[PDB]
Design a protein around this ligand. Sequence first.
Ligand SMILES: CS(=O)(=O)c1ccc(Cl)c(-c2n[nH]c3nc(Oc4ccc(F)cc4F)ncc23)c1
Length: 346
Amino acid sequence: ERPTFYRQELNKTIWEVPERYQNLSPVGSGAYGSVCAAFDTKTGLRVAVKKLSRPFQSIIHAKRTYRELRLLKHMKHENVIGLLDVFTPARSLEEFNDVYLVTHLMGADLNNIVKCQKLTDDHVQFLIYQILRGLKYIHSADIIHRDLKPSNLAVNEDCELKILDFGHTDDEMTGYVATRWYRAPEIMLNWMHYNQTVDIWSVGCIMAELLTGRTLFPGTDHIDQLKLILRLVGTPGAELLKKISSESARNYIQSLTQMPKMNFANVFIGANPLAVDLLEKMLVLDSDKRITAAQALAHAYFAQYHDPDDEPVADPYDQSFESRDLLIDEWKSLTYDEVISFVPPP
Ligand SMILES: CS(=O)(=O)c1ccc(Cl)c(-c2n[nH]c3nc(Oc4ccc(F)cc4F)ncc23)c1
């Protein structure tokens, strides 16, 4: 049955939401999108409500809207942001033009927690364990995050973690920016068609930063960052070179003076030797040889948290729509169907 909706001006747009959602207050100051905190009187939950901006203005935007709804509707895991609710004030497909997404309100993002500070090894174990647990779930559905970084890792005061934004312009990847610091080199420099292990590179970067309080590869640009990466992990061998399908990228790589891999125990002084070992297995230049999420969970570093029976995989995720070319109204109808058919979690 259709709830009663009420109207309110918030982020210079009119939010129209069910009565159950009270005390809407904008959060993140633009960083999370058009997002409000609210109290869900039906569940007693503090929630985050995201209103999608002009979701069907173009083919690209319409498909992107469908993509996000599909992704969020699929994710049902403790360490992954899922959907508590999705709604539209529209009574039919013809008046459908706004999409509102509801999830748990989290306390902070990881960036605001690390705050130039070393975390205790125990805190690192727990946070990384949860990230890896969430990624095992995400990867098992053949979904890649592609953009893991502290700012899309949300945490409560109990240190319980959820991953946001799973599934950027040139200007915002330019220069001394956190938007690029956690990216695998193969994706940063378009070496090849990339796979799930790009996310593992990001975890390695995050893990190191939690351990030292410092960005692992704070490159001032793409080239500076590559040099920082290669100084640590060594220049690519012949084997990886072959796999760089971009002739241009491969040619540039070979112009660099060869460097051996550094000793991680000398790089991460004082760190748990098990943490060093895992970092070594995550920060492998050849993505084929990086540890997977499922493998990392079984690493001795997570002994006090690892439970093979409590690390679920995902239902199959049909993403055949990604290779599909459709019109705006067709993407819009597909999205509408997904909104209408939503069933809230117990
Ligand atoms: C205490 S706070 O300032 O309100 C705060 C701080 C940091 C974060 Cl990460 C958050 C936060 N909690 N839950 C979120 N969800 C999103 O994005 C959404 C993702 C899918 C949805 F269905 C709906 C969303 F709003 N963004 C940010 C958040 C809140």
